[PDB]
Subunit: 213 residues, 4 copies
């Protein structure tokens, strides 16, 4: 395994939040865990909104391809910035930065959430889980990948709440050549198992990349 340390700080419609935590993961298994505690009270919004913010290092890649997030550990790393747009008009801006120790990844992530209306499902208990996603990944030259995915939550209703996520991963050194020399996209299937309250949050996440299913 590898050890994970995680801190998440930001504001949602102006309200400050912070979570602190960690877990473990096993990249050859594409599995990781992260359990985290709010250090400033009950969160003011559904904690399910943060499962996807609580480490692409832990994803399996298909035979022939190296996880370029993993491969970046010993060569200056990478950052990821996501703009997320929710169907009710709210916007989540997320920055991900990482530090590595022999045997550990530490992430420091910043969130800025603005524009969720007062009647937003994020201010209810309506969200019962985050659903699986497949991200489309392709290079933009040798140091950058561009990501896009749709992402939904299941509501008590039946019924779904949706968003669109666009991401930009900037790499210090050249992306692993298996990724660059590929010439079509790579797809990243992700799902979470979430066990949340309003002040303690936990995920198990599975990440499996593929060219074809």
């Amino acid at each position: 395994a590898m050890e994970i340390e995680c801190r998440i700080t930001g504001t949602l419609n102006g309200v400050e939040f912070e979570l602190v935590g960690g877990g473990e993961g096993t990249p050859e298994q594409g599995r990781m865990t992260n359990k985290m505690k709010s250090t400033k009270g009950a969160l003011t919004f559904s904690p399910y909104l943060l499962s996807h913010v609580m480490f692409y290092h832990f994803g399996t890649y298909p035979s022939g391809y190296e996880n370029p997030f993993l491969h970046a550990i010993n060569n200056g790393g990478y950052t990821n910035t996501r703009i997320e747009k929710y169907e009710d008009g709210g916007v989540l801006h997320v920055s991900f930065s990482y530090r590595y120790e022999a045997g550990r990844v530490i992430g420091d992530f910043k969130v800025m959430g603005t524009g969720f209306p007062e009647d937003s499902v994020i201010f209810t208990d309506k969200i019962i889980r985050s659903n699986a996603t497949v991200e489309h990944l392709h290079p933009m030259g040798d140091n950058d990948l561009d990501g896009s995915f749709t992402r939904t939550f299941s509501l008590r209703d039946g019924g779904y709440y949706s968003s669109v996520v666009d991401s930009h991963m900037h790499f210090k050194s050249a992306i692993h050549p298996s990724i660059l020399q590929n010439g079509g996209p790579m797809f990243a299937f992700r799902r979470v198992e979430e066990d949340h309250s309003n002040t303690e949050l936990g995920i198990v996440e599975y990440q499996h990349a593929f060219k074809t299913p």
Copy 2:
């Protein structure tokens, strides 16, 4: 079982210029396979024929154990329409509507394209595009009669670049969507890839479609 006949007509305008293709092929849903070769009736196309590969039948897709192709299922009960809005990174938009007609072992697409807003310097008026890359669409039901889809779609360019688009789709069903799809916990994913053999009068694809919950 086997091998359904496909007929296809594509008409439309791209930046004002009327175009029209006709042709068809065949396909095997159990394999997730279809073919379609089509010819221009109005002379050479003014833009890359790769732009029409994904307009040249979601009936021809495999679905995992336990689930049925809802597009397939609809054939025998009121059917479905699909309308795509595709926004190209240089500002071009294609609006595409698919309508279908059904005969014994035969499926007939009549599709309308309105492309607008593409800049004179667009890659689509060059020969830069050399194939369409694979995609995975996120599909989720909207109530009982509708599926919403979204996917990012890229073309590879001669120089090693990419030309990209975002497609948003809305599928409306005349009868209820097959219960295997409605009872699902979350989205279904639809992986599609094409093999293209194009000129700008004489276009052909082979398409593979494989839906899954998990890869």
Copy 3:
């Protein structure tokens, strides 16, 4: 100084075919026009307000120094407009506008495809009470194309808003009037409609005022 207006609108809204015919008159120099149109298929299955902005950019004032490019196009092969409108509940309206001219008369034939409006959409209720005003940002895409974009709202009976984003593509047969092209910087087009609508009978009065700076 008033041209006669004739108008047909045909389309579908989530599958359902609708058709309106009618007309009015307008005076460019005032930036004013009227249009009254009646459904040919009994009551509409959606808010009539949805059609107000489909119910003639010719009838717009332009500042001194400038000529209305729509009005200028009349005698030089004309223009088309295609708008892609994306409503905040996911509905999409794609509208195409084409024009015929005779002396003192413009004849419009308009095509609408609205898709993806959820069954809980405000457009299936009576809550929309009026469209609100807009300012479109317009700039040349080259010598024969205009790109427009605006935000549009309706007011809802209870005090809310239902919003959309409209992106428009105006393609001209001949060069755009030089004053708009030699501009460099956008032009802005303020529009407001007043509506007097039933579910079968629609009527508008519209004011259009283009500007580079507001007073």
Copy 4:
């Protein structure tokens, strides 16, 4: 006048930047000025990208309306957050916050810019000016305004570089009732004069809101 102090911090495509300075302006006139210097050497991108980050307080409103941004100065103020999408795929996320003093508004502004490709116009000297814009503003209940505008730059060759800008303004106290009770949008016309080098940036800006243009 009021005096204007301002700080801008952010990163563009990973590169940290900072500017400090200020200027002044006259809300009755809808005019303000702001001159800023980089405190980490030359910018790595066109300084034109920053003119619209370099104070909605300095905008006129039509008779029978009051500037709700200026009204907010005593009753707890507002923030503004904008997402800006450039046509080449770059994104600017900008947060605006303020503090007040007697005859002074003090802005502190955070920009994060990502995903501008290596071939983007922002890495050239093609931009020659920011063009005029008209923002559509309307309320989301009593303490929120929603903004949207399209924004272009003119390029040396005669082309344009564009972006679409979505803004969210949150008010601590209810918006001015002249705005809340409009029952339509208010439109905000804005235009800029710019004289920038890669280290020293300066604009003049005018802002005039209106219900109808005439």
